[PDB]
Structure 1
Amino acid sequence: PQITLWKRPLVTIKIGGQLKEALLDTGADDTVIEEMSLPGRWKPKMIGGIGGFIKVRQYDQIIIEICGHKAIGTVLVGPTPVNIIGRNLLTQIGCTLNF
């Protein structure tokens, strides 16, 4: 698909047996999701955005589905104001910027 940028590029994702709305964010290095349970081991991490840093839990090797496209990667879980799909997963679905 081709997604325009007149409004926020929000998509439905499937993660940890849940459906969530998330933002396709080329400015995010990492994928960051609001509080939820994920299986497996995790370690703490600090990530910095515009307003400073937040503490998140880092889960590795998590399968996500974005627009029928399956991918696997690290997912950070914490107090993000919006669920964000970052470059670590955008690359896996073959997402590019075009102009």
Structure 2
Amino acid sequence: PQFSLWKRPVVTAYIEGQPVEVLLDTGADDSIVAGIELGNNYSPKIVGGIGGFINTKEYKNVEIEVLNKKVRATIMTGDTPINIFGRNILTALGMSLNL
């Protein structure tokens, strides 16, 4: 698939079975999702963007299916105004920005 950036590139991913809409973002190192609970097994981490820092809960080896690809990876959870799939994910999917 090709995502011509004329529209925000939002896609549906399933995090361990639950579906969620995520922006594929090259300007993000990490993947942050709001609204799902992944448990007791987390490391607190703080993330940064425009406007500021937000605390997150880091989960490792989270199972993900997005774009007919099934991958396992790191996912943070936090109060993100929108769910982001960053470079850690896009790399695992073999996605790229081409010109």
Give me the TM-score of the superposition, normalised by structure 1.
0.95
Q: 2: distance between equivalents of 1:40 and 1:63? A: 16
Q: 2: distance between equivalents of 1:18 and 1:94? A: 23
Superposition CA RMSD, Å = 1.0
Flag structure 2 segments of 5+ consecutive residues without an equivalent: none
How far did residue 73 of structure 1 move? 1.1
Give the structure 2 partner of residue 26 of structure 1: 26
How far did residue 71 of structure 1 move? 1.2
**Contact 1:56 1:76 survives alignment (8 Å):** yes
Change in CA separation of 1:40 and 1:68 when aligned onto 2, cut-off 3 Å: farther
Amino acid at match of 1:38: L
Deviates more, 1:36-45 or 1:63-72: 36-45
- Identical positions, percent: 49
Question: What is the count of residue pairs matched by the alignment?
Answer: 99
Give me the TM-score of the superposition, normalised by structure 2.
0.95
Is residue 41 of structure 2 the alignment partner of residue 41 of structure 1?
yes
Deviates more, 1:32-41 or 1:46-55: 32-41
CA deviation map 1:10-54 (0-9, x unaligned): 001000321111000000000000031114610100000011100
